[PDB]
Design an enzyme around this catalytic site. Structure first.
Site: not given
Ligand SMILES: O=C(O)[C@H](Cc1c[nH]c2ccccc12)NC(=O)C(F)(F)C(F)(F)C(F)(F)C(F)(F)C(F)(F)C(F)(F)C(F)(F)C(F)(F)C(F)(F)F
Ligand code: HEM
Ligand SMILES: O=C(O)[C@H](Cc1c[nH]c2ccccc12)NC(=O)C(F)(F)C(F)(F)C(F)(F)C(F)(F)C(F)(F)C(F)(F)C(F)(F)C(F)(F)C(F)(F)F
Ligand code: HEM
Lengths: 452, 452
Positions: A265, A390, A397
């Site tokens: 990210t 975030f 986050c």
């Molecule tokens: O996984 C899901 O439940 C649905 C798609 C889906 C899959 N099957 C479904 C059935 C019914 C309705 C929806 C769905 N996912 C999405 O809409 C999606 F946007 F692709 C997603 F998966 F949420 C997502 F954005 F890619 C994500 F996984 F949430 C995510 F944001 F990329 C993430 F994985 F959470 C992330 F935060 F970015 C992450 F974990 F950091 C990662 F990308 F994995 F590194």
């Molecule tokens: C631009 C950078 C980043 C973006 C846009 C981002 C975005 C997000 C988002 C959207 C979530 C919420 C996910 C959800 O609700 O399912 C999340 C959770 C989290 N992020 Fe990030 N993130 C970033 C960088 C980082 C970094 C650098 C770290 C750690 C070093 C980190 C650690 C986490 C953790 C641990 C959570 C889970 C928090 C909890 O639920 O307690 N993230 N982040």
């Protein structure tokens, strides 16, 4: 009569996500159908929200809690009950949350600053050492930086990504683990023998990650040596509520989690930020002028990074247009009614489509596709739940301040040390791996010849 | 009847070189047969010399001149009439020699020193940044260093080898070009169309080398900038004798020639030196004490490098045992009798087996296999023509001062900054690629935590 996109008989809406760019597909659907649409697959349903009007209700933590989307459930197989892939009601979520929050404050960044500079200087040196006709592979170099930074600041471990083309045995496993989890979203009958080889591979990658990380944990415990990094904080840290420490298995899951979320990210952010800068030369110049005015020493100080106001605005505007973790999932804690119109029952799910929220014209004005960092002149002017790169509330986050300090420092240094050229007139192509990146984004960087 | 090793029918002695380790094979033959043996192939004869008494006569420039061995004739396909692969009587040898000699002098090293330090520091930082569990791949890292040093020092070009696992496309082609040159020596019937592929690749590699180098030459001409490097000196310089400069084609051959020497001979020397140091802890103690006592500044000076006498002695003793360009070829200018016993006709070829010369018991004593730098405490004590790691006379290594300065600097810094461990109890295994290196030599380095 909730809007819903085109269906495929018994498969319902599922084949719509059978694409390499599903989030961008969902955004297009949102443009067609508006602030809310139903999405059905066999045996499941969610609702995609795109307007601030609805998302402000969704972000009410008394009404909705974080849901583990399908993608997260699969990530859980290797991230376990780490902060990112745990339910709020799991004891290890609240324990880890309470223990780790202090080590992630704006103020904790003072302690990590030196280690961030170490990696940032490696990036600058790499670019200073390129020959005249050579160019920079941006997402690739930002990933070397962000991985190495979280490795060093968080666990005192050097991935040494700037010494390699072939990235660490851990990361290849991690990337391949992430790949497999992504694919399973479009896979009828998971028990099919056809996927035996995929299950085999998935298992091998977990063992790589678990063995490396556990080993470091144990080396550090044996060693007894005091760094101030995340791992130290976790080894000694007690949760104020329970009085308990994290156990070693959970500490591992946290390490894997930090390594995953959000090296990718954060590298995305930096890549999109530089993309927008080279496409908007007046904005680049303003940002470069700030960096030159503020970063007066060969080594940036923590205070100086905090003074990069415009660079911060640039990063927020990049997060507005392309939030690199583009969606998050919620469930209703009790029966409730959304927007005065859409009744929901306990357990019903929502998806917050962040890129669409960030294009809500009622909040941002008509010019939503334009890159204008000035929107963030006063970030307090932005209404509640209008800008959510975030995520939300207690499940936001934890790494937000880390990511923003890292990105500001590095982008500041980049703008101080180089002029940039979009030498191919790059056409934006956003690759999706759950997270978002500008694939193939390349530039040339001409040194301003300012010593480090 | 001159001694001669075993034969293979009409192929005579040729198949004796159908081995991965031909020089080491020739050394064993020399131990069996003594100071001289004849070696026949179809249509070819040479005599291998091993004793100081015969080699001192061979080194009489009035009686013998440099010959291009078969290996050099093949290398000439890409190194052309550069210094290393030209005949003494070709106009371009003396011309280039006169032009380049002052650029390779001891005094010229003062000018190269700063860029040698640049790459040396990159090596030290790389090792400082390894994790505790990790080890060093010695010849691989020495080759990164030596290639980069000659690239930077000589043509202001950064190969950035410490940023890679896969080497620069130029290096890839050059190594493959060299390998092919050696493979032609042992393969019977070179016209066989099974080698159509080998030919195809060879020409592609020659092209890659030429296009890169020609481009750099054209760019420096086009820009007209001045650096403290060999390329500058070659574009501006005139031979005092003819009053002629080198043309661009010969300049390219010189560049290719210098790159081959960096890549091969100097990295081998550093690798063997470190090998002998870890096998001989008392020698290591003395070298390390000197480095600590002499290199009192974070950035070594030219003057400090000249002060590392013992480090110099270590390097010479490593050159005594494993001279990394282990043989050179001569031809009789006229009919002559060698050593009062062996009559030679005009054109007859001699091979000097340097490792055997260096094990001549009548010069060195019976303990010739032991590593004793104190053999070199006084250069004057070494008899004439007993020590020839850099060849002979006007055709001796032009790069000797460069190689010894680089190696002394780098070894000095290594011993200043790290303690070394032979963690595998490495068994010496010498790979031959027309130079010698210790294949698979690995060590661990524990930092002494002295800042750069
Ligand atoms: O996984 C899901 O439940 C649905 C798609 C889906 C899959 N099957 C479904 C059935 C019914 C309705 C929806 C769905 N996912 C999405 O809409 C999606 F946007 F692709 C997603 F998966 F949420 C997502 F954005 F890619 C994500 F996984 F949430 C995510 F944001 F990329 C993430 F994985 F959470 C992330 F935060 F970015 C992450 F974990 F950091 C990662 F990308 F994995 F590194
Ligand atoms: C631009 C950078 C980043 C973006 C846009 C981002 C975005 C997000 C988002 C959207 C979530 C919420 C996910 C959800 O609700 O399912 C999340 C959770 C989290 N992020 Fe990030 N993130 C970033 C960088 C980082 C970094 C650098 C770290 C750690 C070093 C980190 C650690 C986490 C953790 C641990 C959570 C889970 C928090 C909890 O639920 O307690 N993230 N982040
Ligand atoms: O090529 C020859 O005439 C004879 C082998 C020979 C003798 N009689 C022959 C008859 C037919 C075919 C081959 C032979 N040459 C060698 O033994 C030899 F090539 F000199 C060598 F010993 F292998 C050698 F030492 F590796 C070398 F090639 F001379 C050398 F010294 F390493 C070298 F090639 F000159 C070198 F200096 F290391 C180098 F050229 F710089 C290189 F390594 F290639 F970079
Ligand atoms: C430890 C390092 C080195 C060793 C052991 C070494 C050894 C030798 C030897 C033995 C020769 C004579 C070859 C013959 O008679 O056929 C030679 C020639 C040569 N070496 Fe080196 N060398 C080394 C480093 C270098 C370096 C670093 C360069 C250039 C930067 C270089 C450039 C040359 C050139 C140009 C010749 C040909 C000189 C001429 O005939 O005019 N060498 N070297």
């Amino acid at each position: 009569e909730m809007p819903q996109p085109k269906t495929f008989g018994e498969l319902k809406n599922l084949p719509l996500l059978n694409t390499d760019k599903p989030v961008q597909a969902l955004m297009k659907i949102a443009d067609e159908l508006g602030e809310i649409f139903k999405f059905e697959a066999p045996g499941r349903v969610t609702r995609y929200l795109s307007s601030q009007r609805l998302i402000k209700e969704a972000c009410d933590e008394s009404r909705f809690d974080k849901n583990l989307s399908q993608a997260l459930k699969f990530v859980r197989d290797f991230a376990g009950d780490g902060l990112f892939t745990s339910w709020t009601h799991e004891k290890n979520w609240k324990k880890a949350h309470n223990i780790l929050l202090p080590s992630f404050s704006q103020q904790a960044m003072k302690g990590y600053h030196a280690m961030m500079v170490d990696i940032a200087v490696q990036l600058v040196q790499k670019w200073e050492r390129l020959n005249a006709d050579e160019h920079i592979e941006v997402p690739e170099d930002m990933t070397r930086l962000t991985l190495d930074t979280i490795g060093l600041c968080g666990f005192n471990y050097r991935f040494n990504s700037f010494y390699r083309d072939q990235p660490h045995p851990f990361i290849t496993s991690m990337v391949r683990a992430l790949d497999e989890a992504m694919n399973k979203l479009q896979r009828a009958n998971p028990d099919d023998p056809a996927y035996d080889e995929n299950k085999r591979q998935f298992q091998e990658d977990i063992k790589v990650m678990n063995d490396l990380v556990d080993k470091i944990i144990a080396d550090r415990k044996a060693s007894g040596e005091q760094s101030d990094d995340l791992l130290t904080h976790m080894l000694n840290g007690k949760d104020p509520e329970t009085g308990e420490p994290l156990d070693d298995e959970n500490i591992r899951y946290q390490i894997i989690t930090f390594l995953i979320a959000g090296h990718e990210t954060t590298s995305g952010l930096l890549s999109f930020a530089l993309y927008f800068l080279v496409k908007n030369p007046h904005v680049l110049q303003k940002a470069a002028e700030e960096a030159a005015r503020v970063l007066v020493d060969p080594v940036p100080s923590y205070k100086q990074v905090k003074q990069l106001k415009y660079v911060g605005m640039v990063l927020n505007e990049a997060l507005r247009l392309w939030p690199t973790a583009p969606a998050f999932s919620l469930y209703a804690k009790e029966d409730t009614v959304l927007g005065g119109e859409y009744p929901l029952e306990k357990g019903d799910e929502l998806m917050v489509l962040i890129p669409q929220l960030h294009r809500d014209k009622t909040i941002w004005g008509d010019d939503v596709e334009e890159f204008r960092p000035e929107r963030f002149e006063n970030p307090s002017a932005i209404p509640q739940h209008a800008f959510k790169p975030f995520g939300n509330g207690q499940r936001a986050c934890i790494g937000q301040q880390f990511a923003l300090h890292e990105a500001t420092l590095v982008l500041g240094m980049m703008l101080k040390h180089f002029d940039f050229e979009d030498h191919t007139n790059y056409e934006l192509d956003i690759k999706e791996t759950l997270t978002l990146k500008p694939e193939g984004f390349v530039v040339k960087a001409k040194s301003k010849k300012i010593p480090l």
